[PDB]
Amino acid sequence: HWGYGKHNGPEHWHKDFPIAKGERQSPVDIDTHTAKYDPSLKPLSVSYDQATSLRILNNGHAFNVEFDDSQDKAVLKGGPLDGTYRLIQFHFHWGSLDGQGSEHTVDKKKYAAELHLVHWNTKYGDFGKAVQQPDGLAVLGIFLKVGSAKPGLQKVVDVLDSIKTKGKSADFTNFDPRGLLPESLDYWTYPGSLTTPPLLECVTWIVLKEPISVSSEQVLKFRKLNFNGEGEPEELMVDNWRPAQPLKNRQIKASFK
Numbered sequence: 001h002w003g004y005g006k007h008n009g010p011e012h013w014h015k016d017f018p019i020a021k022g023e024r025q026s027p028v029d030i031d032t033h034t035a036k037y038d039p040s041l042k043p044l045s046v047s048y049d050q051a052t053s054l055r056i057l058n059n060g061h062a063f064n065v066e067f068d069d070s071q072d073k074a075v076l077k078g079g080p081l082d083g084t085y086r087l088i089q090f091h092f093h094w095g096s097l098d099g100q101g102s103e104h105t106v107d108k109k110k111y112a113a114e115l116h117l118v119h120w121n122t123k124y125g126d127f128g129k130a131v132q133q134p135d136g137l138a139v140l141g142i143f144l145k146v147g148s149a150k151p152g153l154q155k156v157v158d159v160l161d162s163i164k165t166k167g168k169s170a171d172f173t174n175f176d177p178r179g180l181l182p183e184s185l186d187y188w189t190y191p192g193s194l195t196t197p198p199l200l201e202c203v204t205w206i207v208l209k210e211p212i213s214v215s216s217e218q219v220l221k222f223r224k225l226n227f228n229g230e231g232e233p234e235e236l237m238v239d240n241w242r243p244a245q246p247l248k249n250r251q252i253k254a255s256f257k
């Protein structure tokens with residue numbers, strides 16, 4: 001029953017998930033002036049050359065591209081991380097309008113969408129164990145602005161009509177997530193949470209400074225998806241973002257000056 005509506009949206013989630021009011025919730029606004037450059041932060045190591053995509057799923061929240069995570073095929077290392085984190089899936093959040101849709105904001109600026117590449121710390125053995133740990137996940141967040149198309153996004157765009165409604169999936173092999181990355185891997189980082197229920201406080205967030213551009217047509221195709229299942233009243237899948245949460249007793253670090 002949680003969702004993004006008037007009667008079941010972010011404002012309501014604390015009743016079923018009291019951690020919603022916790023000490024390390026995400027997303028947050030990234031105040032670029034008060035983020036501290038940390039010269040000890042390492043470059044991010046994104047190793048996606050052996051990624052094995054399997055499937056794309058509409059789970060009633062977003063669309064989700066899932067990978068084989070039963071071996072170290074696509075991993076994230078370095079940056080603020082001390083472990084080796086395996087890619088399990090990516091998904092997006094987006095708006096009804098080009099001027100909203102991101103979860104994180106930058107100096108209060110909202111982007112049209114935000115890509116989340118989810119990785120789990122291999123020292124915990126499975127994803128289900130990892131989400132129970134304060135250093136279980138590392139989510140790489142990438143902003144999307146509307147402008148020129150992103151060619152490496154088009155294969156995703158093109159399959160969306162085959163997963164229009166909740167519970168639909170489609171085979172999605174040989175997708176290369178390197179086509180979704182910007183030129184720079186400069187980043188901000190802070191400790192936070194899942195941005196959807198169950199809102200677990202298990203995530204090291206790494207948000208890239210440089211957005212990617214996508215076209216107005218690419219994001220318009222995201223907005224054709226449905227929150228509902230087939231045979232139910234149509235509800236367009238838009239505005240599936242949680243707003244910025246209190247930073248509380250946290251410092252956002254920058255890898256760059």
Ligand SMILES: NS(=O)(=O)c1c(F)c(F)c2c(c1F)N(CC1CCCCCCC1)CCS2(=O)=O
Binds near residue numbers: 061203
């Ligand atoms: N936004 S976020 O990056 O913090 C985030 C996340 F970190 C995740 F790990 C997952 C998310 C999710 F958003 N989702 C959304 C799911 C999470 C809970 C299970 C199924 C219900 C829909 C929402 C995809 C599955 S998931 O891979 O478990």
Ligand SMILES: [Zn+2]
Binds near residue numbers: 091092093116195
């Ligand atoms: Zn997300």
